[PDB]
């Protein structure tokens, strides 16, 4: 599920 | 423009009419499912039921298609061309099925694979329900990003397929391979019985698979057989007990070869490449979600 | 309504009483586990032990239910309706079990599946422990988000099930299918021995499964058998050696058919769809976590 | 304090001495690996080599332990108590092994599982290398977060184990279970041959496993056998061809029972629960990483 | 310094010439794939086709290499040393193949593994296509981060391999192990028939694998066999039905030993360690992506 986690991070950090 | 086009078009775009067509789509799919569940045989028991049910559903879908086109001036190039095209295709095949059922076998017995296209009418439900549409549009806008990692993984799989055909395409060709024990060294027999002939250090295990082949011919007999074997190994299915271990043990002191072959393939392709493909897929989908 | 309900209710809400009921729940579950571990047989050895233990536990749980309802004026519609309802159901079944044990077989031998509901008393522990509750509430608020991708995956699985019943539902119906050799071409025999009859290029491999069937009848005999086969393939269980490979090698020159069938199913459903379902699930859960 | 304690302690904390002890740890582990690779038998061929090598390594590790304790005033409660304790344990067992090798069998033949503790000396390497330490500390601070979801998953597994023992613990007890086919309805035989006795609709397939049991006794004979079966199903290992399918096809018309059993177990436990456990694990680890 | 080298160098670096070399690379790879698909046998049918095709491709790749080096003053140490080196190696082997095809067997029959290096020419395509290059550079800059968790996982696998060789390396050495059943206890027989001799509580199941071995010799006979067995268990392949269950049920009352062995291995290595390795891999790759 690492793929899911990474996508989640990228989305949030990019928004930040 | 057609004198009756506008109100008919905004009627076909109505919420209730779309929901009714959706109900009719799901009922037709359930009808096909039920045909395959309760009447799958060649010599069917209730043949008229499925035939006339498909007929009635095709008639209703044809009427829906005509109401659609009548509302868009019968053009369908301009407005919603993709779904209109798919609908036209499936209803054209349905009309072909009506003709086939009534007045002869218009199509050769070869291309019945097109009669089998009824199952794919359910895809029209994805247009009406905004959630399924959201999912499939994200999937479609995610696939091109996957293309690159997919091509890399396939390149590596074809490399391993060439290597596998060169190496193992004749493993067990006689139908049998020999594996050597450690009997005297372990304790199961004494060295004298071997030299006399009472025991042995080799077992002539047979190599036939449950498909009638030998290990080499089936798993790596050709390049596409080998590519399929490597797909089955990529998904983790019996890669050791069926594929790897007979190769690994067939060669007595050259066991590093097949072991490194399968271990390197599994590590690289399975772990790294599948996780990268799926990761870029989910990344693209979460991109489109937000 | 009741004279001392206000204090009885706040007594039942006490930390220690909830922890004691939790201890009693876990002890009852361990009692059922121990019954199945040390005394699973039909003709039990220590039958009175399990019977009277279930009796005592049901009595204590009934007393707990009465203390509960006595504290909420015996209504239980207003305050914590879900857990109160579940508790009422399980203790009602427990009282049925007490009656069944004492004064006759009140229930027909058919619906013992309801006596088996003792195992699910442990779910009442999830209410008291704030961590397990935290997990199951996140799961519950995550499942509706999954619903859409789940329905898409099931739609595709039923499509493939219809296709599979149409194609393979008669593979190996005789009990045997033929696979074709490359013996003359490889080197194992010379072409003359084949024409004379010493060797052959076909092997009449048998198709019976370890279930007594043929390959087609068991794996794709009907639509629900095929949907179950496709579930087993979706989880990756023996999809090649048991399901795919006999089909792939049954065909002489059209092995692209079954190969593309199973490869497309695996790619689409397994990789893309399972990872999307699990991804939206975990996304919803991390949403609720924060 | 000891008059020689300070400089000796700062000498044992030196970079080079720690790297040398690390080299010695890895060499001892490689020595054990090599013993098992080149000399695994009961009647070993080079017994003195492994014996005196373990002796020399134990001597060097004892000297290292004494240099350690001499530098911390021989207390080891105050400074780095965990690793000092583990080191004291392993070197104490090593000294026991020295005594055992020289002057008798001090330990009963029962607890050799403690002589097997040499393999775990390698864990001392994790203290010196800052990367492996960084990984295991994250793992340790991640496990308590997993505890909750793990307990939920185990609760559900025990529920399913009780259910499985109640249902299937006698499947195939005779050694054979009967399965029924649609022979007449499909076309393989005509209904008259069945009534006359030429064909049948039932096949008395045998239920013995490759361990010698019956299907029920081995897979769900008791509660711990059933819990182990459900673990094997949770990891996806032959859950259908070995576990599920004989149960599913044992029932004539109630195949919904076992199908729903295994499908619900797989969905819930495998997909949802394993992915939630692993997700909270990786979440905790990325928490500690940053 | 060549007189027209600068002009020549630009031509090599042109878009169209790189795309043409890429087309030529892909065509050569497809040629090798097609050789293995349509002509894999030892006694080939169209041998001249593949020979002269490899010859022509090697000639074109040699001309490309010479145009390359002529443009960089034939140095190739200073400009793009890695790909130039790889290209020089593969074309040197191709020239060796030309010589081998024309004027004798220059190489001993031993090292044909180097003639097999044609398949790896396709890697040169990764330099020209910016997407595949982007993927492989991320992979390369991600692997060193994985190194640590990989070394931890391998340390644990070798620990378990030593333990497995010590424990199970003689399981079923006779070729048979006995398993005990609760026939009298469960109801299948009465205790009197056992004491008389009509039934038994032990079944002498055989331990030979489909490789001709015994369970212990093949799966844990040595340390590298055990490390390979633990790799197959790490990937989840038949870890129970082939590896674990015969060990677990060989023991009469100490089934906790092998059960805890395999359960601890699976949990730790599979779940935690594989997910941590893959997680740090994908983390590093998303680092390089952004």
Residue numbers in the entry:
A (entry chain E): 2 to 17
B (entry chain A), C (entry chain C), D (entry chain D), E (entry chain B): 69 to 358
Authors' own words:
The sodium channel NaVEh from Emiliania huxleyi is composed of a N-terminal helix (N-helix), 6 transmembrane segments (S1-S6) and a C-terminal EF-hand like domain (EF-L) with a total of 542 amino acid residues, suggesting the channel is formed in a homotetrameric fashion. The NaVEh structure is assembled by four identical subunits in domain-swapped organization. Each subunit is composed of a voltage-sensing domain (VSD, S1-S4) and a pore module (PM, S5-S6).
To investigate the molecular mechanism underlying fast inactivation of NaVEh independent of the IFM-motif, we purified a homogeneous sample of NaVEh in detergents, and performed cryo-EM single-particle analysis of the purified sample, yielding a final reconstruction map at an overall resolution of 2.8 Å. The excellent density map allowed accurate de novo model building of the region W69-D358. Strikingly, a strong tubular density of ~26 Å in length was observed half-embedded in the intracellular activation gate of NaVEh. The VSD of NaVEh was resolved in an activated conformation, similar to other NaV channel structures. The van der Waals diameter for the activation gate of NaVEh is ~8 Å, wider than the size of hydrated Na+ (7.2 Å), indicating that the gate of NaVEh is fully open. Sequence analysis shows that the first two helical-turns of the N-helix are composed of hydrophobic or small side-chain residues followed by five consecutive positively charged residues of Arg9-Arg13 (Arg-cluster). However, the N-helix embedded inside the activation gate buries a total surface of 1688-Å2, almost 2-fold greater than the IFM-motif.
